[PDB]
Amino acid sequence: QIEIFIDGKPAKVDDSYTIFQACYENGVIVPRFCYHERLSVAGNCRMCLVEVENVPKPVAACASQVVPGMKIKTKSEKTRIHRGNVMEFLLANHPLDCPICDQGGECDLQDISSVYGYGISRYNEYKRAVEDKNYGPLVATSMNRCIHCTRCVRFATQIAGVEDLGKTGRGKAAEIGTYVEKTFNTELSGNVVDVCPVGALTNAPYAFTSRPWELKSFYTSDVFDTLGSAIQVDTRGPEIMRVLPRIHEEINEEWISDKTRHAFDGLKRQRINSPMKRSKDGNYEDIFWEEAIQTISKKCLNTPSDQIGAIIGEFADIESITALKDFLNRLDVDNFEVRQHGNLKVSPDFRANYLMNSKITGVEDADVLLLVGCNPRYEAPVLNARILKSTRKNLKVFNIGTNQDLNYKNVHLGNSTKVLKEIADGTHPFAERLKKAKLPMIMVGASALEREDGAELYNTLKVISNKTGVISEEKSWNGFNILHKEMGRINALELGINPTSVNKNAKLVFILGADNNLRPEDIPADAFVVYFGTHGDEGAYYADIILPTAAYTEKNATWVNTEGRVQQGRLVVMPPGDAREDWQIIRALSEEAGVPLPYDSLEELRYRVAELAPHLLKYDYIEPTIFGKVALSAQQGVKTTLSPTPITDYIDNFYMTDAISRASVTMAKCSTAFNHEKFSNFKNLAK
């Protein structure tokens, strides 16, 4: 705690601050190009130079600590001269590219020049020219605009964990990038664009299409991965133009994965825009809403209760599942699955059963992490970056299952389920390794829990946790975590739907937008299928009736995070064509079926939700639970027999994991450009 002076006003800061940090906290804005709040401190540019008395040379605000009693004069003429000189040197070799540069209208170079520069040039010689490089279909390069700020190199090294970028050469002829012709293939690759202050690196799908001033922005959350990444959607009229990350510091920090950023263009094609009916020969005809609802209502009134089933889709929100559950309960139906295998063997009795009890930030708190059938590099790239940051700070990672090329170091305990049995039964060194750890943490992927012995694996994991001390009241620590793969499954668990209640033979199936893991043998050949959906890749080919619905960006809904956080997805554009809201369709069908539901707007539906579970009305919040040890208690006499089969992951192609991503053009381009290069049957022993 020391006293400094900024433009004559005394202020109190901490002795560990830099001048830039003190100025920003005191409301003073200092121009900068190379400093970033999350990367290491570099002082290559000199735009943050300020003037301090008794110090002859200008001092870089970002790379200099504060001194007790010092005075910073950011409004003196000397500071103006320093900024003008630095801006002049920066613009001496910059190309006249603003009309063709995608950074125009949001370039920090432009704004800083306008506000702080001299305002005119005197350089009258040839500028340097740099040949462009090819980094892939996601990043476009125009290297005449680079100012050698090292932000991309520092981001790649310290955040992405990849070591492909650098600075080769010397003097003015030095160049930023890879030495050889190599693509910048990685998850979180597009993030580097947001880091680069100039148009040197640009969003290749978002090439030439838009300008910053003709866009309207909305705040929402992502559903492509079970981490509810906070995102900003920029649109122009009825067209969504781009997706950017936001700041949360508890989710995704500042960063989003490439699927979150780019797979939104799968909403522009393969869309279902009107209700349809399929004939016996397979012909599809567009019909009215009234006719479709009347047909389904007749089927509901005629079909026996035991022959009715449902499938819950990957992108199913709380309101839709509440509506369907209430309607089928009114119809005396308690089965919400018809698929024989692939069901999660987790009881929805307690919230701690199926949630991330240590939250996303828990990777920073734990010292030993054990992945069981989990591949964070593909299932949660931002969580993978967080784990990498933590492993740089004394976090040890062990893995049971398929060995993966994580950008950090992990110890392979084994491949099959025999390692887990050895750990649970003792006589394995990892039991003592867990016992000596301060805060042990176990992350089991949801995929490993749809094994035919998923319940036995769950019981074995509970036994291991209770024996080692992953769950302990003395430490007030709950290290048991499940990394889910579908948002709809999380919402169904939160509402209280048992995933293991399966109708063996159903003659009337409501498919609420489920396309993954769908095979023709699951649905009987003599059944009646009603598919609620937005895309026509799968499920729409099983359906006698197809009802168009609204995507996640086309409705106001509530989504539960994989750590238990309740979030609002907000309407950005109305659903195309004749599509309708899921709960509105279900309510209309219930009214036409003689069992109307007691809600007519979103407010009354949320009142019903509050009747079911109040915690779903608290947004951007996680409700604490005090039943962790009761829920995860190692029960006596429960089966713990595991098949001698290796534990694998569920993702082959990262860029295409669902209908929206499958209907995307940039995802197909990324697949074509990166799948052959990223595929390997051997471990990269360098990392």
Partner 1 sequence: LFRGEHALRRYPTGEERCIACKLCQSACPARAITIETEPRPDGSRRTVRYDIDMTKCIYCGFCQEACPVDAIVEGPNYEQTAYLHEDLFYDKYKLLENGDKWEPQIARNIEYLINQPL
Partner 2 sequence: LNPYSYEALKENHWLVSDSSKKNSEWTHKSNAEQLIAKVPIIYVDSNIVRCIGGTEINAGHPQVYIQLDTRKHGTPQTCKYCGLRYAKKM
Partner 3 sequence: MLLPYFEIQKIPAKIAKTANEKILSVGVAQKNNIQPKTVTAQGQIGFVQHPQLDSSCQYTQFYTPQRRDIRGRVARIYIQDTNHMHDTPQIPEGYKWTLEFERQAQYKTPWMGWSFNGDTFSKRNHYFCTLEDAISYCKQMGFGYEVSFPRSRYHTRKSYADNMLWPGHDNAVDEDC
Question: Which residues of the chain form contacts with partner 1 (CB under 8 A)?
Answer: 98-100, 104, 207-211, 213-214
| 146 known member of a binding site | yes
Report DSSP letters for 454-481, one per residue: HHHHHHHHHHHHHHHTSEETTTTEE-EE
Using CB under 6 A as the binding rule, whether residue 198 contacts ligand FES is answered as no
Considering only 146, 292, 434, 631, the residue that binds ligand SF4 (CB under 6 A) is 146
Q: For the chain, first and last CA: distance in Å?
A: 42
| 101 known member of a binding site | yes
Using CB under 6 A as the binding rule, whether residue 45 contacts ligand FES is answered as yes
Considering only 26, 134, 556, 648, the residue that binds partner 2 (CB under 8 A) is 134
Considering only 4, 72, 201, 204, the residue that binds partner 2 (CB under 8 A) is 204
Q: How far is the CB of 203 from ligand SF4 (least distance, A)?
A: 13
Which of partner 3, partner 1, ligand FES, none does residue 268 bind (CB under 5 to 8 Å by kind)? none
Phi/psi zone of residue 591: left (φ > 0), alpha (ψ -120 to 50 degrees), beta?
Answer: alpha
Q: CA-to-CA distance for 421 and 130, rounded, in angstroms?
A: 59
DSSP state of 156: I
Using CB under 6 A as the binding rule, whether residue 97 contacts ligand SF4 is answered as yes
Nearer Cβ to partner 2 (26/178): 178
Which of partner 1, partner 3, ligand FES, none does residue 214 bind (CB under 5 to 8 Å by kind)? partner 1
Using CB under 6 A as the binding rule, whether residue 32 contacts ligand FES is answered as yes
Beta strands across the sheet bearing 59-60: 9-13, 2-6, 71-73, 49-52, 59-60
Which residues, including other chains, have CB under 8 Å from residue 60's CB and lie 6 or more apart? 43, 46, 48, 49, 50
Q: CA-to-CA distance for 4 and 402, rounded, in angstroms?
A: 55
* Binding-residue pattern over the window 160 to 199 for ligand SF4, x denoting contact by CB under 6 A: ----------------x------------------xx-xx
Nearer Cβ to partner 2 (239/332): 239
Q: CA-to-CA distance for 329 and 598, rounded, in angstroms?
A: 13
Q: CA-to-CA distance for 420 and 619, rounded, in angstroms?
A: 37
**Longest Cα pair distance anywhere in the chain, in angstroms?**
91
Does residue 442 sit in helix, strand or coil?
strand
Residues 48 to 67 in contact with ligand FES, rule: CB under 6 A: 48, 60, 62-63
Extract the runs of DSSP E, i.e. beta strands, from 386-522. 396-400, 410-414, 440-445, 471-472, 477-478, 480-483, 508-512
Using CB under 6 A as the binding rule, whether residue 17 contacts ligand FES is answered as no
| 94 known member of a binding site | yes
CB 591 within 8 A of CB 582: no
Burial of 506 (0-12, 13-18, 19+ CB in 10 A): buried
CB 198 within 8 A of CB 103: yes
Q: CA-to-CA distance for 377 and 165, rounded, in angstroms?
A: 20
Q: CA-to-CA distance for 280 and 393, rounded, in angstroms?
A: 63
Q: List interacting residues with partner 3 (CB under 8 A).
A: 16, 18, 21, 29, 31-32, 37-38, 40-41, 43, 62-63, 65, 106-108, 111-112, 114-115, 194, 197, 212, 217-219, 230, 232, 237-238, 244-250, 254, 396, 411, 433, 556, 568, 570-574, 598-600, 603-604, 606-611, 614-615, 617-621
Residues lying near ligand FES in the complex (CB under 6 A) are found at: 32-35, 43, 45-48, 60, 62-63
Name the binding residues for [2Fe-2S] cluster: 33-35, 45-46, 48, 62
Binding site members for [4Fe-4S] cluster: 94, 98, 101, 107, 146, 149, 152, 196
Please state the residue numbers annotated as binding site.
33-35, 45-46, 48, 62, 94, 98, 101, 107, 146, 149, 152, 196
> Which residues lie near partner 2 (CB under 8 A)?
95-97, 99-100, 126-131, 134, 136-137, 140, 144, 181, 204, 669, 672-673, 676
Residues that bind ligand SF4 (CB under 6 A): 94, 97-99, 101, 103-104, 107, 109-110, 145-152, 176, 195-196, 198-201
